[PDB]
């Protein structure tokens, strides 16, 4: 029981922490572009996607090999708890 509680607490923790850096690197560049639009008046609502695509695709570029060694380290542990 205490491992079923631990494995459920860690699956939600890894979802929270792996979707952390791409969702805070697409937030500062969602807010500072609009703060530039508060100084100079622009009425183009479809503007900060041009930076949001480069922000998410460059954050997923440097940490690409890092996600594989957190998914493999958690996926090998849960099967050892399953079988043994």
């Amino acid at each position: 029981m205490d491992d079923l509680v631990f494995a459920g607490n860690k699956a939600l923790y890894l979802v929270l922490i792996l979707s952390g850096w791409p969702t805070i690197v697409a937030t500062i560049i969602g807010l500072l572009v609009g703060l530039f639009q508060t100084v100079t008046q622009l009425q183009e609502q479809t503007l900060p996607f041009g930076i949001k695509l480069l922000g998410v695709c460059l954050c997923l570029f440097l940490l690409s090999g890092w996600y594989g060694e957190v998914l493999l380290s958690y996926g090998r542990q849960v099967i050892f708890l399953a079988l043994a």
Partner: protein
Amino acid sequence: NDISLIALLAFSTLLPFIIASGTCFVKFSIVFVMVRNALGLQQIPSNMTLNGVALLLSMFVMWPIMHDAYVYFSSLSKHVDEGLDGYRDYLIKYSDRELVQFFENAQLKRQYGEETETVKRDKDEIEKPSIFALLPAYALSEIKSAFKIGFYLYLPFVVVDLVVSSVLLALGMMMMSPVTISTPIKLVLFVALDGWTLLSKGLILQYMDIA
């Protein structure tokens, strides 16, 4: 010799009946299907195949136990009791204790009446349960054990799907199904982990041992 084909049409359905109900084939078929639903595939890998691979591993394990029923072979029922001690001992080891006692008491309540003394756990030292109480309880105890393995197997992929559906909502791509992106990167988690040589490696070690 077609006068015994009325019993051949019973023995050729009773021999797969024990296979699909009371042996280890039930655990292997549920785990193999639930890892197909864990990845998110519907047809492939074509469970006509998976009922053959699960039968090859179950006959691999059931080969020494069934062979003792052939080295041997009101009045014939006491002869078949001596021929069926290895199967009753295999069903005792892997069924549930709290569930066989339920099927034992409901049978005594069925046969003799409501004033029958309730059987407790302390019979287990010398008294052995019947073959009609182990056989329904073994199937449910392997449905419980295979669903227990399949939830653990299920968890990593759900971790992949909940980050993929989060980054497709960070970008403004809410009108985009995340299955078409996750299904490539859900397949690397099964080939870099070589789980086909890990589930079959572990499920054999639960029932037999090496060296």
